[PDB]
């Protein structure tokens, strides 16, 4: 399994080297085209054939980048997802319906996020050693998206109280901080849904959502539908179903 | 300027050839990558379809690059080579081929056309050989060989011969072919087949002697001249009677 995974990646990495070489040749050829016709030799037929060649190289160069992205998303889904999924699922077994004694226990011995980060670090270390930056970065980006998607799914299965919401806010901010260190990209957009869920899960009372919603939305652009907002409010065990359903969103 | 424009064009086109060969070697590496990628049970429908499409596209563009190179070389030949070569060939017209021994001997002592023509060609060929890859150089000399054959045929058909003039032409043609043979492939024989056959006709002792070499009497030779063209070439001999030429059953 590990062999077949790394072979796939190393092969894609060589596709990327070849693709970069095609781009460098295209640039040499663009300069050749200008030089070739610069002194009155070469008519319409040669000029049209050269333009057509260059256009074809632009087109296939775009296709090679798409191939690489497709390869990496398939690798991520086939080989990385099966490893990450259990680590994310572990969140479900950490109570987020907690009193101060448990919250203080969690402050002293972190129950999930720190080990999750260590697991991601080890996993990603295998790739950074063997892949070019462009490939490593793209793969890291896919892993980051996978983490946001799967974390959202396990949160939606979990039960919170107010202090558990506070715990989740710390865990989420820690995770986003780590994933930010491993890339040059901003991951704020990828984590916007989770950040908005953390806001909901930290409300003092159901009706407090109205302070951040609709006309009072102000800065924040909600990525969640009213139905999704109600689904997240419902994760709070202290938030009454009847009250959530009747909320004017 | 026009020599430097010509050489700049050729050197640039030669670089295009180097690039296209590099594309071909990359395509080969990529074909091996595609096989290796799917060899261990990872990879789905989309990655397979995309990779196959990428390779098909590289195949298509390699064909277009070959087309471009050939177009480039034929235009260079027409634009930069033909205008130098045409005057050199047209000079044949000013050399009498209706001659007696005194003039034939003059020509032996001081060659009137072909040796300078060969020198003129050599200077071009050597310029090309020093700056171009074998593939481009060979393609270019093939185009040049064809051009010389076409243009020399035209000027011959405008010229007047007697027997000894025909003998002079046979020497001149054999020297030219001997030279060109050293810069192109064996196809020179086919390119110059019409001219060699014209030389045979221009070296006949009498009109009826053509029947010794024609039709059933061809032997291994396949004539590349029509009956009308044979009569046209016979007519270049000022000593040959129109009546006799028309008599021939070809």
User: At how many Å resolution was this determined?
Assistant: 1.9
Dihedral sign from CA coordinates of A114, A116, A118, A124: negative
Long-range contacts of B120-123 (CB under 8 A, 24+ apart): B120/B84, B120/B88, B121/B85, B121/B88, B121/B148, B121/B179, B121/B180, B122/B179
- Using a CB-CB distance cutoff of 8 angstroms, which residues of chain A are in contact with residue B30? 15, 18
| Residue B211 backbone dihedrals phi, psi, to 5 degrees | -65, -20
CA distance B196 to B235: 17
- The C-alpha angle A164, A169, A171, rounded to 5 degrees, equals 90
Copy the structure tokens of residue A44.
């319409």
Structure determination method: X-ray
Q: Which residues of chain A have a CB within 8 Å of the CB of B19?
A: 25, 28-29, 32
Q: How far apart are CA B156 and CA A114, in angstroms?
A: 94
**Residue ranges in A156-205 assigned as alpha helix (H):** 162-181, 192-201
Lookup result for tokens 């590349």: B224
Task: List the single residue in B with minimal CA-CA distance to A3.
Answer: B40
Angle at the Cα of B210 from the Cα atoms of B209 and B212, rounded to 5 degrees: 70
- Number of Cβ atoms within 10 Å of the Cβ of A117: 18
Residue B50: which of A67, A227, A90, A100 has the closest Cα? A67
* Cβ contact A41–B65 (<8 Å): no
Of residues A71, A63, A209, the one with CA closest to residue A135: A71
Residue B140 neighbours by CB under 8 Å, 6+ apart: B10, B73, B76, B77, B128, B132
Binding-face residues of B in 31-60 toward A, CB within 8 A: 33, 36-37, 39-44, 46-47, 50-51, 53-54, 57-58, 60
**Per DSSP, what are the bridge partners of residue B151?**
none
The secondary structure of residue B113, as a DSSP letter, is: S
Q: Is B133 left (phi over 0), alpha (psi -120 to 50) or beta?
A: beta
C-beta neighbour count of A26 within 10 angstroms:
19
Around A227, how many Cα atoms within 13 Å sit in the side-chain half-sphere? 0
Place of tokens 């009677």: B241
Scanning chain B, the segments in alpha helix (DSSP H) are: 2-37, 45-76, 82-90, 101-109, 114-131, 134-156, 163-181, 188-191, 193-202, 227-234, 242-247
Q: What is the SS3 assignment for A23-77?
A: HHHHHHHHHHHHHHCCCCCCCHHHHHHHHHHHHHHHHHHHHHHHHHHHHHHHHHH
Separation in Å, CA B237 to CA A184, B202, B234: 86, 7, 6
Question: How far does the CA of residue A71 sit from the closest CA of chain B (Å)?
Answer: 6
A196 close to A223: Cβ distance less than 8 angstroms: yes
All structural domains of chain A, each given as residue ranges with its CATH number in brackets, are 1-79 (1.10.287.1060), 80-249 (1.20.58.1970)
Cross-chain residue pair A3–B40, CB shorter than 8 Å = yes
Instruction: Say if CB B76 and CB B13 are below 8 A apart.
Output: yes
Name the β-bridge partners of A236: A160
What is the C-alpha to C-alpha distance for residues B40 and A3, in angstroms, rounded to an integer? 9
Closest CA to B32 of A59, A14, A69: A14
């Amino acid at each position: 399994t590990d062999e077949a995974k790394m072979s796939f990646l190393v092969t894609l990495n060589n596709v990327e080297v070849c693709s970069e070489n095609i781009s460098t040749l295209k640039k040499t050829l663009e300069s050749d085209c200008t030089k070739l016709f610069s002194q009155g030799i070469g008519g319409e037929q040669a000029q049209a054939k050269f333009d057509s060649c260059l256009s074809d190289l632009a087109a296939v160069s775009n296709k090679f980048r798409d191939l690489l992205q497709e390869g990496l998303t398939e690798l991520n889904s086939t080989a990385i997802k099966p490893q990450v999924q259990p680590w994310i699922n572990s969140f479900f077994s950490v109570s987020h319906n907690i009193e101060e004694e448990e919250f203080n226990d969690y402050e002293a011995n972190d129950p999930w996020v720190q080990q999750f980060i260590l697991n991601l670090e080890q996993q990603m270390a295998e790739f950074k050693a063997s892949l070019s930056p462009v490939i490593y970065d793209s793969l890291t980006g896919l892993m980051t998206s996978l983490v946001a998607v799967e974390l959202e799914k396990v949160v939606l299965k979990s039960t919170f109280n107010r202090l558990g919401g506070l715990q989740f806010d710390k865990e989420l901010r820690s995770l986003i901080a780590y994933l930010t260190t491993v890339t040059t990209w901003t991951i704020r957009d990828k984590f916007a849904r989770l950040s908005q869920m953390a806001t909901i899960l930290n409300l003092e009372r159901v009706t407090e959502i109205l302070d951040y919603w609709g006309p009072n939305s102000g800065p924040l652009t909600w990525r969640l539908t009213p139905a999704e907002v109600r689904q997240v409010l419902a994760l709070r065990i202290d938030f009454r179903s009847e009250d959530i359903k009747r909320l004017r969103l």
